[PDB]
Amino acid sequence: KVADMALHYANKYNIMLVRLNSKWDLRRLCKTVGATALPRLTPPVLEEMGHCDSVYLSEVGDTQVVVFKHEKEDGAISTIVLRGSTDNLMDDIERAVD
Amino acid sequence: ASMGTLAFDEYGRPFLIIKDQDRKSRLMGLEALKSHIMAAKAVANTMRTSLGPNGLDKMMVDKDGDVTVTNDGATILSMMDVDHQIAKLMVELSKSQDDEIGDGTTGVVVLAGALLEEAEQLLDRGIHPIRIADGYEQAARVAIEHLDKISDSVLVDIKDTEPLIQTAKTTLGSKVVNSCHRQMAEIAVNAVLTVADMERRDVDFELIKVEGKVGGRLEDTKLIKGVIVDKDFSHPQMPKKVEDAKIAILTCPFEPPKPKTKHKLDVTSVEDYKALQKYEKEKFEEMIQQIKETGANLAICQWGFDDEANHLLLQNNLPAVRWVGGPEIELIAIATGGRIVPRFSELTAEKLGFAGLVQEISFGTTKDKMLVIEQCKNSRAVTIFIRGGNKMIIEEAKRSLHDALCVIRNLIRDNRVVYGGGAAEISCALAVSQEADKCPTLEQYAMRAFADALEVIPMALSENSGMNPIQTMTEVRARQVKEMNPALGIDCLHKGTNDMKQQHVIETLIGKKQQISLATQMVRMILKIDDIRKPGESEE
Amino acid sequence: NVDNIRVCKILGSGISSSSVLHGMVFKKETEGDVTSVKDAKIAVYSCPF
Amino acid sequence: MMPTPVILLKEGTDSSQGIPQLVSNISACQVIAEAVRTTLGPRGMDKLIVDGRGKATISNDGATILKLLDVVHPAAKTLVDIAKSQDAEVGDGTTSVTLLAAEFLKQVKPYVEEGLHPQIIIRAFRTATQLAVNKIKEIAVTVKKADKVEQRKLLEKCAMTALSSKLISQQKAFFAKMVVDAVMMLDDLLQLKMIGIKKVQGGALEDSQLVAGVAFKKTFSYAGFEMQPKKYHNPKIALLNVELELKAEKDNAEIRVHTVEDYQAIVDAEWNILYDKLEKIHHSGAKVVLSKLPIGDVATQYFADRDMFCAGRVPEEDLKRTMMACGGSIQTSVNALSADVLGRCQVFEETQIGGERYNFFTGCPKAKTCTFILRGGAEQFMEETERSLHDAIMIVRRAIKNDSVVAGGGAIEMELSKYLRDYSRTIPGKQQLLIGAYAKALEIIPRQLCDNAGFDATNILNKLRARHAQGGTWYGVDINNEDIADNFEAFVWEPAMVRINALTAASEAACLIVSVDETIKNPRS
Ligand SMILES: Nc1ncnc2c1ncn2[C@@H]1O[C@H](COP(=O)(O)OP(=O)(O)O)[C@@H](O)[C@H]1O
Ligand SMILES: Nc1ncnc2c1ncn2[C@@H]1O[C@H](COP(=O)(O)OP(=O)(O)O)[C@@H](O)[C@H]1O
Ligand SMILES: [Mg+2]
Ligand SMILES: [Mg+2]
């Protein structure tokens, strides 16, 4: 969770906050960005700091998403964004992708 | 024509589309419009007998057996227990008229019912309901423009309140409190004018405390330029009357201080016990002395207090009142011109309110006591205190006075007025009919139906007064056409004249405009529904 | 690694509008006021902020 | 079916296979289309649905009606899903998508009955959809001049066209001007949460207003609030996330004292903490105080004594909108209330609106947000007004993103049908029948418009076909004149992406429904 005072001071210092509930999502983000999940709130050392070409808030259709985007055609994790007109159709396309 | 669909496929296989489709009901097409129009007509014809000075009251019983006798249309429709969705729409229309204007909650329902009744015969001739709605909107625009044209401006000055008294009397004429007509009208006008931001701003009804007590007579209802309080003096032996009181409004109980954070005070020796009891005694004496130092003659507390403080207040000649509600505390502070103090340390002479008389009032053989805080210097809060022979007339007086206050508020917001008794409706119908003459043929029927539906109000007023509706309404319309005078209406009270301006039957222009607008929008919204899908389960 | 391929499904534009992103997409918003960074230097914490 | 001693699937499993189940699926889609058929165009009507709890919803939006219908048919749910998808991506056309999909299925039903392979139908649908989308992109009219007046007029025309099917169609010009003004205030993301929509019962539709700022309802004032002034002429606004009440310092904080002097000191310390917070707020120069957390009666009286305004329990969305309108920052701590974290508005006022009190922040020049205040005679009236305004807002946002328009009223559908028929007349012949069926199904929109309006759809369709054949891309149904007209010159404008998404979703739904040859229903758990 994010504390109110912590959020206030993050806003004061112009820091973008993203909260991930799933530990699997956190691990995948660390893998795809290059950061180490610190167990405490200490400032990250140079090697532990992650890097990404662009992080921004965007809207696809009617869904608000947060995108960690790499300009280089590289990285450890790649994401396929599936569009469609029906949930069942996207499930079938996901099965085909699998 | 109901139960959704029933095909079960052309190959004999099950055909289930919607959950519980064999229990749900459906009505579509012109039949749905006819059913809606008939339900709305039933509601409007029920409500039309409570229109005008000669209108009669509906007597509603809730689910617990409590009885309400009322003439207010919005209240009647709220008390009703209905399932039809169009009836709920009519109830919401009355609620909307009550919220925006506060008067004319019965005229809107009658107008909407008449509009839908005319739309029924228009639909029977093969006119698309959207065309009917468009014609109704055009005619409503014409009627609103005519209302703006034929309006009159009244003075809303405190120096001369006679037009305000006349308007309030017109509002209260249909209510049961008309036996005290001018008294109720004048107290309502004075109440509104007292609590009002003069620069045409709003009137905050939170500054008007309307409270009623059984006993006495309806004529005993009075306007108190102060605050009424259901409490009394805490100690039975303090004086029941305080003159030139210097009130200390306090929101701190006369008790030893208590930290909000959970705490423990440890007593570890006999000296600690003695110090603790001495501290408690000194705190009581100190708060009493602090109150007395400001020169206050009376103390009002919100959170009550205990025996030591009570006897110390009695011993120091400080009449005190406890357990006063927060809204009452705010009203007392506003009326007496004093500030609300959260603790004795901040109490000063400059924060004391002033009231010319604080009294305790008995109510016969009931042992109930109440407080009057009146004779304030420039009180900006007012109280209406209502008496009656039974609680039911007390509630009816409450809502009637609320209607009068809302009407005077409307005059403050906008001072343009029109003349009632159906004169405004007849003039608007004439204007709509004249506009329809120079209009393309197809929407002429819709505009003329709108005019005929507008004519329902004078007909209902005449019928409730025992006169022939069609004859009297036709005569009044002909007289209005002959001599240019849109102030001629239905003489419901049989005063011998039809000139409603001479009879001083005045109602707000914005009220009539809002009536017409709301009725037109609701009628259009109902006319556009062509399918009903009810669960039809008839659950218990 | 098969797991290293993520699939995000968003309604609206037909499957012909699908695309491949070098990164990750999360269906959520941002907690703070900043909503866009051009030279991200993400610091990741497993502990609550 | 000889009963085996041990059955394969669980008892009660229902299986339907072959041509009959696909025909039944087509029929179910026809039923779903008929459920919203009569809600199309300026002459469309509304639908009333009552839930089990007894609450009624009255709407003209196809997606809303389909969602309220508790559809359980597996094939019929595809139409509801594509309507929801069209609402999500575009926001308008949720009825046209279902009508087009069901009409595609109805057109190919006779070929399905005679044993035509579904894959051929799917391929024909895909080819026709690709050609139609390419044609829409090719013939869509775009204005490459970057003129503010022309672009605003295009926005207003699109908003009026979107709104000219709802109960607020009489005031469609007024509401379209309001919507275009509202959308142009948003900076770059065009977030819907930055456009507040308030519904106040009582009043005419024309009484609705768009405040160039933020407005929200009064929130449970405490005692002494009525003593605060209710109008300021240049106030500084203190946006806070702070509880200004006498309360425990922490939920796990315990005070242990052994002296009465320390007891009095602790009480005075709590009072001094509260008064220090209040003094820090007051000395910042702010005259209006808003907070998410409760503001107590003590703080209310304190602010009343200083001729200040306070409002606690302000919702998250309203405080964010106030921040975006005034230019402050929501502060969780009052220690540093610098001049750059306080909002600014020209006029703040509390007024009466239909039996309710609202707080108005007007005169904000740097405002990136706005609030709609809707007046109506009923709850469902205001709900449907909000739905119509949402449709218009989504259309205007899409027009901002891409300003390509096509003529409505069935003109684009007729042009696409003519083009597809011309293309199909030059192919072998197995795909020719199916592409012609697609082109004929494309005629469902003008025909349904004429049917709803009470026209004779056959004569209007014949005239439209003749006109499109001999030239004229933008000829559609003229509802008022009982005839056909050039809908582009009549300003019946809709964004091209609306029709593109409609065709794409309808084709995908039709192909998905056709591709299924068996339905298996496991017994309920
Ligand atoms: N003294 C009067 N003489 C004739 N008509 C009146 C008189 N007073 C009021 N009316 C008419 O009676 C109608 C109904 O008013 P009333 O029953 O008081 O409230 P509501 O408009 O809510 O029904 C009004 O339209 C008004 O024109
Ligand atoms: N003034 C108009 N004249 C003729 N056709 C119109 C007009 N306004 C809208 N239409 C048509 O009505 C169709 C349906 O619009 P509408 O019912 O508002 O939403 P949806 O597309 O979700 O059904 C559109 O395809 C459009 O071409
Ligand atoms: Mg009245
Ligand atoms: Mg639309």
Q: Supply φ then ψ for residue D486, to 5 degrees.
A: -75, 100
What is the four-CA torsion angle of D326, D331, D336, D341, rounded to 10 degrees? -10
| Nearest of B215, B465, B230, B259 to residue B360 by alpha carbon | B230
Phi, psi of B113 (to 5 degrees): -65, -45
* Rounded Cα–Cα distance for residues B433 and A35 (Å): 79
- Tokens in use for D13? 């499993």
DSSP for B391-427? HHHHHHHHHHHHHHHHHHHHHHH--EEEETTTHHHHH
Q: Is the dihedral of CA D56, D59, D63, D69 positive or negative?
A: positive
B201 contacts in D (CB within 8 Å)? 231, 351
C36–chain D Cβ distance below 8 A for any pair: no
Among B228, B326, B354, B207, residue whose Cα is nearest residue D226: B207
Query: Are residues D342 and D250 in contact, defined by beta-carbon separation less than 8 angstroms?
Result: no
Distances, alpha carbon B435 to alpha carbons B419, B431, B466, D328, in Å: 22, 6, 32, 54
State the distance between the two ends of chain D, measured CA to CA, in whole angstroms: 26
Q: Between vectors from CA D460 to CA D457 and to CA D461, what angle results, nearest 5°?
A: 80
Per the rule left: phi > 0, alpha: psi between -120 and 50, beta: everything else, B278 is alpha
What are the structure tokens assigned to D511, written together? 């192909």
**Chain C stretch 9-38, residues whose beta carbon is closer than 8 A to a beta carbon of chain A:** 9-38
- Sheet containing A63-69: which strands, arranged edge to edge? C23-26, A63-69, A54-60, C36-37
Ligand nearest to the CA of B53: 1
Interface of A with C in 44-63 (CB under 8 A): 44, 48-57, 60-63
Rounded to the nearest angstrom, the minimum Cα separation between A54 and chain C is 5
Mutate to test the pocket of ligand 2, among D86, D87, D103, D449 (most ligand atoms within 8 A of CB): D449
Q: Phi first, then psi: give them for residue D166, nearest 5 degrees.
A: -110, 175
Q: Which helix (H) or strand (E) holds D58?
A: strand D56-59
- Please say whether the beta carbons of D333 and D284 come within 8 A: no
Taking alpha carbons only, the member of A19, D330, D489, D272 closest to residue B346 is D272
Cα angle, residue D387 at apex, residues D406 and D52 outer, rounded to 5°: 130
Structure tokens at D131: 């050609």
Asked whether the beta carbons of residue D223 and residue B340 sit closer than 8 angstroms, the reply is yes
Determine if ligand 2 sits within 6 Å of the CB of residue D42. Answer: yes
**Residue linked to tokens 């006319």:** B527
Give the distance (Å) from ligand 1 centre to CA of residue B183.
19
Q: Are B404 and B168 in contact (CB under 8 A)?
A: yes
Two tokens at B43?
Answer: 């509601």
Which helix or strand (DSSP H or E) is residue B125 part of?
Answer: none
Report the C-alpha gap between B509 and D357 in whole angstroms: 23
Which amino acid, A40?
A: R
Counting ligands in written order, which one lies closest to the CA of residue B74? 1
Provide residues with CB under 6 Å of ligand 1: B 51-53, 55, 73, 103-107, 170, 173-174, 420-421, 457, 461, 490, 492-493, 505, 507
| Integer Rg of chain B from CA | 31
Half-sphere exposure of B18 (CA within 13 A, CB side): 25
Q: At what angle are helices B469-482 and B456-464 packed, to 10 degrees? A: 130
**Tokens read off for B527:** 């006319």
Which H/E stretch holds residue B141? helix B129-149
The 3-state DSSP class for residue B314 equals helix
3-state secondary structure of D59: strand
d(CA C12, CA D89): 5
Chain D residues touching C13 at Cβ < 8 A: 89, 501, 504
Distance CA B478, CA B497 (A): 15
d(CA B417, CA B510): 8
Supply φ then ψ for residue B438, to 5 degrees: -100, 35
Please give the positions of D annotated as active site.
61, 94-95, 391
**The residue to which tokens 């990404």 are assigned:** A52
As a whole number of angstroms, the distance between CA A53 and CA A33 comes to 10
DSSP B65: S
Strands B382-388 and B208-214: parallel
CB atoms within 10 A of CB A21: 10
Side chain identity, residue B168: A
Cα(B305)–Cα(B287) distance, integer angstroms: 12
Question: How far apart (Å, rounded) are the C-alpha atoms in residues B216 and D288?
Answer: 47
Phi, psi of D199 (to 5 degrees): -115, 120
**D95 appears as a binding residue in the annotation:** yes
Q: What interhelical angle do B423-437 and B469-482 show, nearest 10?
A: 70
Q: Two tokens at D122?
A: 């799917």
Amino acid at B363: F
Q: How far is D324 from chain C (nearest CA, A)?
A: 11
Give the span between the Cα atoms of D39 and D452, in whole angstroms. 8
What the block records as the tokens of D128 is 């026709």
Tell me which DSSP letter residue A43 carries.
Answer: P
Residues C7 and A97: beta-carbon distance below 8 Å = yes
> D62 to chain B, minimum CA–CA distance in Å?
14
Q: Could you tell me which chain A residue has the CA closest to the CA of C21?
A: A79
Contact A64 C27 (CB under 8 A): yes
**Dist CA B298 CA B378 (whole Å):** 19
Name beta bridge partners: C11.
A84
| SS3 at position B60 | strand
Which residues in chain B have their C atom more than 2.5 Å from the N of the next written residue, marking a break after them?
none
Query: DSSP per residue over D10-55, as a string?
Result: PTT-EEEESHHHHHHHHHHHHHHHHHHTT--STT--EEEEE-TTS-
In whole angstroms, give the CA distance from residue D297 to residue B322: 18
CB D60 within 8 A of CB D384: yes
D161 within ligand 2 shell (Cβ under 6 A): yes
Of D386, D377, D48, D204, nearest in space to B91 by CA: D377
B270 CB neighbour count, 10 Å cutoff: 8
**The one-letter amino acid at D460:** I
Per-residue tokens: D121: 């139908």
> Chain D contact for A45, CB < 8 A?
no
DSSP state of D289: E
The single-letter DSSP state of residue D313 is S
Chain B hits for D454, CB-CB cut-off 8 Å, are: 128
3 state SS of D68: helix
Q: What is the rounded distance in angstroms from the CA atom of residue D30 to the CA atom of residue D7?
A: 36
> Using an 8 Å Cβ cutoff, are B247 and B296 in contact?
yes
Tell me the residues of chain B between 187 and 246 that have a Cβ less than 8 Å away from chain D: 201-204, 206-207
Segments in D69-226 forming alpha helices (H)? 77-89, 94-113, 118-139, 148-163, 172-185
Tokens encoding C38: 């051009």
Q: How many CB atoms neighbour CB B277 within 10 A?
A: 11
CA of B52 to the centre of ligand 1 (A): 4
Q: Does B145 touch chain D (CB under 8 A)?
A: no
DSSP letters, D121-155, are HHHHHHHHHHHHHHHHHHH-EE-TT--HHHHHHHH
Rounded Cα distance between B55 and B490, Å, is 14
Query: CA-to-CA distance for D214 and D197, rounded, in angstroms?
Result: 10
Q: Tell me which residue of D11, D64, D104 sits closest to D513, measured CA to CA.
A: D104
Q: Which two tokens stand for residue B252?
A: 């701190």
Q: How many Å apart are CA D475 and CA D143, to the nearest integer? A: 20
**Backbone angles phi and psi of D359, in degrees to 5:** -100, 125
**Which residues are in the CB-under-5-Å shell of ion ligand 4?**
D 92, 162
For C17, list phi and psi in degrees, rounded to 5: -90, 5
Give the mutation candidate from A31, A81, A90 for the C interface (greatest C CB count, under 10 A). A81
Q: Which of B534, B523, B442, B520 is nearest to B143 (CA)?
A: B520
**Distance of alpha carbon A3 from alpha carbon B491, whole angstroms:** 72
Gaps in chain D after residue (C–N beyond 2.5 Å) = none
D230: nearest Cα among B193, B201, B226: B201
Closest CA to D385 of D179, D192, D90: D179
Q: Inter-chain contact D505–A85, Cβ cutoff 8 Å?
A: yes
CA distance B299 to B250: 7
Query: Is D27 marked within a binding site?
Result: no
Q: Are B473 and B420 in contact (CB under 8 A)?
A: no
Both structure tokens of B382: 């007012």
The answer to whether D92 touches D393, Cβ cutoff 8 Å, is no
Amino acid at A78: S
Phi-psi region of B446 (alpha: psi -120 to 50; beta: other; left: phi over 0): alpha
Q: Quick check: B234 and B319 in contact, CB under 8 A? A: no
Give phi and psi for D405, each to the nearest 5: -125, 155
- Yes or no: say if D213 and D325 are a contact pair by the CB < 8 Å rule: yes
Pocket test for ligand 1, best of B51, B78, B494, B498 (most atoms within 8 A of CB): B51
- Give partners of A (≥3 CB pairs < 8 A): C, D
> How many CB atoms neighbour CB B424 within 10 A?
30
Tell whether residue D93 is among the known ligand binding residues: yes
Q: What's at A5, amino acid-wise?
A: M
B60 by Cβ neighbours in 10 Å (0-12 / 13-18 / 19+) ranks as middle
What's the distance, CA D299 to chain centroid? 40
Maximum C-alpha span of chain C: 40
Q: Which residues contact D469 (CB under 8 A, 6 or more apart)?
A: D418
Q: Name B258's Cβ contacts closer than 8 Å, sequence gap at least 6.
A: D267
Chain D stretch 170-199, residues whose beta carbon is closer than 8 A to a beta carbon of chain B = 170
| Experimental technique behind these coordinates | cryo-EM
The H or E element containing residue D198 is: strand D195-201
Ligand nearest, relative to CA of residue B417: 1
Do D505 and C14 make contact, defined as CB atoms within 8 angstroms?
yes
Q: Residue D377: name the closest of C3, C30, B518 by CA.
A: B518
Q: Is C13 on the interface with D (CB under 8 A)?
A: yes
- Picking from A65, A36, A35, the residue whose alpha carbon sits closest to that of residue A51 is A35
β strands within chain C, DSSP E:
5-11, 19-21, 23-26, 36-37
User: Beta strands D236-240 and D288-291: pairing type?
Assistant: parallel
CA distances (Å), origin D121, targets D25, D76, D124, D168, D429: 15, 19, 5, 41, 13
Closest alpha carbon within chain D to B534: D50
Q: Chain C neighbours among D 105-164 (CB < 8 Å)?
A: none
> What is the rounded end-to-end Cα distance, in angstroms, of chain A?
33
Contact across the interface for A8 and D241, Cβ inside 8 Å: yes
For B230, counting Cβ atoms within 10 Å of its Cβ (0-12 exposed, 13-18 middle, 19+ buried), the class is middle
Q: At what angle do helices B181-194 and B391-413 cross, to 10 degrees?
A: 50
Report the binding-site residues of B for ATP.
52, 105-106, 421
What does DSSP say about strands A78-84 and C5-11: parallel, antiparallel, or unpaired?
parallel
Question: Is the Cβ of D332 closer than 8 Å to some Cβ of chain A?
Answer: yes
C-alpha D111/C-alpha B476 separation (Å) is 71
Shortest Cα–Cα distance, A85 to chain C (Å): 5
What residues of B are labeled active site?
72, 105-106, 403
C35 contacts D89? CB cut-off 8 A: no
Query: C1 to chain D nearest CA, in Å?
Result: 32
- Test the B interface: residue of D170, D172, D175 with most B CBs within 10 Å: D170
Phi-psi region of B104 (alpha: psi -120 to 50; beta: other; left: phi over 0): left
Which one-letter DSSP state was computed for residue B323?
S
Is D91 annotated in a binding site? The answer is no
CA D222 to chain centre: 36
